[PDB]
Design a binder for this molecule. Structure first.
Ligand SMILES: *[C@@H]1O[C@H](CO[C@@H]2O[C@@H](C)[C@@H](O)[C@@H](O)[C@@H]2O)[C@@H](O[C@@H]2O[C@H](CO)[C@@H](O)[C@H](O)[C@H]2NC(C)=O)[C@H](O)[C@H]1NC(C)=O
Ligand SMILES: *[C@@H]1O[C@H](CO)[C@@H](O[C@@H]2O[C@H](CO)[C@@H](O)[C@H](O)[C@H]2NC(C)=O)[C@H](O)[C@H]1NC(C)=O
Ligand SMILES: *[C@@H]1O[C@H](CO)[C@@H](O)[C@H](O)[C@H]1NC(C)=O
Ligand SMILES: *[C@@H]1O[C@H](CO)[C@@H](O)[C@H](O)[C@H]1NC(C)=O
Ligand SMILES: *[C@@H]1O[C@H](CO)[C@@H](O)[C@H](O)[C@H]1NC(C)=O
Ligand SMILES: [Zn+2]
Lengths: 195, 596
């Protein structure tokens, strides 16, 4: 009856930092996945355990749309079994990831001449992330064997770093908005469909 | 938590902050050099200040990680570069004094001027006034006046400053655990901890001297031919067995003999191949020139220019009110931004310069994936050698024929090939004894082998002995003639111009071997050969990450700098010069001088 709010996720004025990625639960609506064919570049559109061609052929218990911003080189890390700063410490997909990854260049929106320091990412962490885990802590990373006392200094770094997007950066360093549609399959009425 | 992983993480932080801070400094420098205002100067210095202060802060923090504790050579290389970027080694008082001296000598060189003896109101700077006389005037006395006035007026000011500069730079070097400042400079070629690729600082002296011996036959015949031609034009001023007077060499110091071509041209009846006319005929512009240069690098397998290159670069003079520093330079700002600043005119000179500067960009793009601290040529001579070989290939008549600027009508006779090699030898070969002899004098002064009261005595003994050049006027120790050259008074190493010259012909012979070129090496074009492009790329992507000896091997199959490819390039001229000097005295006598 009522269309799924994909506009709210893809057309958001400002995306979340990848370290504090945004999750929107999609439920109880008709899903015109077709309307996604907007934001024409769609620099990447890769689905897993499922095919894009006629995606409307399915029914799921729940859909999760994860949104964040990274830079061009790191889009390849948004994929199962990938490795690197983003996949290790910010947003990790599982090995058997069932869903899709959509990313497009937002250099016109997320870049500034003076540098856009709104978008951050996690640079250091004691360990890797579990799939779909989120760490938003701002505790000082300890590199030495001495305690940091909640302030950055020698061998003690603030764990979160900025991209500083500028419009004249190369394609690899330009900002890209990313959406990760996860498709949940449980033993439940499976109330997300639509022709 | 080992002290190696703490350094791994310290470099992690450093790289990410450095690329952001370096970009702001690089872009502020770009905006000044392309749009000269009082405001853009402020930003350029402010961003440059925060970049320097960031580095000095990080050099201090990098020195807290003992280098010896790191097994990983990549990490050890990066920390070493950050720690030796520390001149927090002298006291604050001597550090302040040394910078003051460096600025004073720089100011004297850039602002010093001499005034004409007839008219004490008409005066001239080095650039553009005095250089104009040294490159164009055929008048003995006008050349003698400018040569002596520069040294006796500006050089004498620099003499006491250089004496204190030598002392403090040596104190800086000794406290950094080098023998002297010359030993410090030779550290750019040093390699440690890699078996079969090591290179010591003392080895550079021996390899420069060993290779220079093999140059002497070619130089002595070039010197003999040039002297014989100059004697015809200046019969009363030049001895047939003496050294060449220092003010008759084509520029202010004789660093290059390029401007002697008009008086020394072997076959002056033939033209120089100049496609400047054909380019204007076909209505080329700067865009077409750089599109053609981009096509050249694609033809060997290298990638084309990024989209931001065409958007952000300045390939023409903006003219009108907006002034720009028009010196052709290639910019690697970081974060994928690559630019070329060039006030291009539609000339063959600028068409070649485009290929040279785009060669720099190709090197910049190839090692862009390396860590920030390893994004440079393998040593100081690599980056310039890469640029030179591109203008070598693009200038050959084969390449000019294929791109349609030189019709198949033009037949290359053996005499334009001798005219071409003579002009090349005047620049490429004539500078090698000059470059070697100057840096040898500086190395000896820093080592303390030349006392202050024999500085100018030994400088002119070595000029006569090694370069075959004699001063036209005696100079006591109130002079400082080395400091009359930019690189000496502005604190730059000079041996890079010798090693780069040898590398570029080592590169070209290897790339032409991969391109299956048959014929003299000077006729070679590596266009349309992807094996040559691949062979070059394997070195380009290394940057500073591997020893320059190994990076050299990935191109040419040898671990050390070699002079044979240079002689191979100039062999046709060498056989002609030996023929030409049949009835002329080859060599020179050090005791003859033009001042009786
Ligand atoms: C310390 O380093 C600075 C800057 O070098 C930069 O950082 C390096 C790691 C590498 O990335 C370089 O490409 C960078 O340029 C040196 O400053 C430069 O000095 C030269 C001449 O001395 C000058 O032409 C440059 O403009 C300077 N760099 C900038 C950004 O203005 C400095 O010389 C080094 N100090 C010592 C003591 O070695
Ligand atoms: C020195 O350390 C570097 C890492 O800084 C090593 O290169 C990396 O090796 C790891 C293996 O654990 C790979 O995951 C990386 O892809 C490599 N590259 C980079 C840029 O990290 C290198 O192998 C080490 N050398 C020695 C001899 O141990
Ligand atoms: C150059 O800078 C001045 C400000 O100092 C500005 O008025 C002018 O528009 C600038 N020109 C360009 C091409 O950026
Ligand atoms: C040249 O640049 C374009 C930019 O779109 C790129 O697609 C192409 O692969 C590059 N190489 C060639 C040979 O065109
Ligand atoms: C060019 O070749 C001719 C014979 O083909 C020869 O006589 C002449 O000397 C050659 N020129 C030079 C400079 O060697
Ligand atoms: Zn260059």
């Amino acid at each position: 009856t009522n269309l799924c709010p994909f506009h709210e996720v893809f057309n958001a004025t400002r995306f979340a930092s990848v370290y504090a990625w945004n999750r929107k639960r999609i439920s109880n609506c008709v899903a015109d996945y077709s309307v996604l064919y907007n934001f024409a570049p769609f620099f990447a559109f890769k689905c897993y355990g499922v095919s894009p061609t006629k995606l409307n052929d399915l029914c799921f218990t729940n859909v999760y749309a994860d949104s964040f911003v990274i830079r061009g080189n790191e889009v390849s890390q948004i994929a199962p079994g990938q490795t690197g700063n983003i996949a290790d410490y910010n947003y990790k997909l599982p090995d058997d990831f069932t869903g899709c990854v959509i990313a497009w260049n937002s250099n016109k929106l997320d870049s500034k001449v003076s540098g856009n320091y709104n978008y951050l990412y996690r640079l250091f962490r004691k360990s890797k992330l579990k799939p779909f885990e989120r760490d938003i802590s701002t505790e000082i990373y300890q590199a030495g064997n001495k305690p940091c006392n909640g302030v950055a200094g020698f061998n003690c770094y603030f764990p979160l770093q900025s991209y500083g997007f500028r419009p004249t950066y190369g394609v690899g360093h330009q900002p890209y908005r990313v959406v990760v549609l996860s498709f949940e399959l449980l033993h439940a009425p499976a109330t997300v469909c639509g022709p | 938590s080992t002290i190696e992983e703490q350094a791994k993480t310290f470099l992690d932080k450093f790289n990410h902050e450095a690329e952001d801070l370096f970009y702001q400094s690089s872009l502020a420098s770009w905006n000044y050099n392309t749009n000269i205002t009082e405001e853009n100067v402020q930003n350029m210095n402010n961003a440059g200040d925060k970049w320097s202060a960031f580095l000095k802060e990080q050099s201090t923090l990098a020195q807290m990680y003992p280098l010896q504790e790191i097994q990983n050579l990549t990490v050890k290389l990066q920390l070493q570069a950050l720690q030796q970027n520390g001149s927090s080694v002298l006291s604050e008082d001597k550090s302040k004094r040394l910078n003051t001296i460096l600025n004073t000598m720089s100011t004297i060189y850039s602002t010093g001027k001499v005034c004409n003896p007839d008219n004490p109101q008409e005066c001239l700077l080095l650039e553009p006034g005095l250089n104009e006389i040294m490159a164009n005037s055929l008048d003995y006395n006008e050349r003698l006046w400018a040569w002596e006035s520069w040294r006796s007026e500006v050089g004498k000011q620099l003499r006491p400053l250089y004496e204190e500069y030598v002392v403090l730079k040596n104190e800086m070097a000794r406290a950094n655990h080098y023998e002297d400042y010359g030993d410090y400079w030779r550290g750019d070629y040093e390699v440690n901890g890699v078996d079969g690729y090591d290179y010591s600082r003392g080895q550079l002296i021996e390899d420069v001297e060993h290779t220079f011996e093999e140059i002497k036959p070619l130089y002595e015949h070039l010197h003999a031919y040039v002297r014989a031609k100059l004697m015809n034009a200046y019969p009363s001023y030049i001895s047939p067995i003496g050294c060449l007077p220092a003010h008759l060499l084509g520029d202010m110091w004789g660093r290059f003999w390029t401007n002697l071509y008009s008086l020394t041209v072997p076959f002056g009846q033939k033209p120089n191949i100049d496609v400047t006319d054909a380019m204007v005929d076909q209505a080329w512009d700067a865009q077409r020139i750089f599109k053609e240069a981009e096509k050249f690098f694609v033809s060997v397998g290298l990638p084309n220019m990024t989209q931001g290159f065409w958007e952000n670069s300045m390939l023409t003079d903006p003219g009108n009110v907006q002034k720009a520093v028009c010196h052709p330079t290639a910019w690697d700002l970081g974060k994928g931004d690559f630019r070329i600043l060039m006030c291009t005119k539609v000339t063959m000179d600028d068409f070649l310069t485009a290929h040279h500067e785009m060669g720099h960009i190709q090197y910049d793009m190839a090692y862009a994936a390396q860590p920030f601290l390893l994004r440079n040529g393998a040593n100081e001579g690599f980056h310039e050698a890469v640029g030179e070989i591109m203008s070598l290939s693009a200038a050959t008549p084969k390449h000019l024929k294929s791109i349609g600027l030189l019709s198949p009508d033009f037949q290359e006779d053996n005499e334009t090939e001798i005219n071409f090699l003579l002009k090349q030898a005047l620049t490429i070969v004539g500078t090698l004894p000059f470059t070697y002899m100057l840096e040898k004098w500086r190395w000896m002064v820093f080592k303390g082998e030349i006392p202050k009261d024999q500085w100018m005595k030994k400088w002119w003994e070595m000029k006569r002995e090694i370069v075959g050049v004699v001063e036209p006027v005696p100079h006591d120790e109130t002079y400082c003639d080395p400091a009359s050259l930019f690189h000496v008074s502005n604190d730059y190493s000079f041996i890079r111009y010798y090693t780069r010259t040898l590398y570029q012909f080592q590169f070209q012979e290897a790339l032409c071997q991969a391109a299956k070129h048959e014929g003299p090496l000077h006729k070679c074009d590596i266009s349309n050969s992807t094996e040559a492009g691949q062979k070059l790329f394997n070195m380009l992507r290394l940057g500073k990450s591997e020893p320059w000896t190994l990076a050299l091997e990935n191109v040419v199959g040898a671990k050390n700098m070699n002079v044979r490819p240079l002689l191979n390039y100039f062999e046709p001229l060498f056989t002609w010069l030996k023929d030409q000097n049949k009835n002329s005295f080859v060599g020179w006598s050090t005791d003859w001088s033009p001042y009786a």
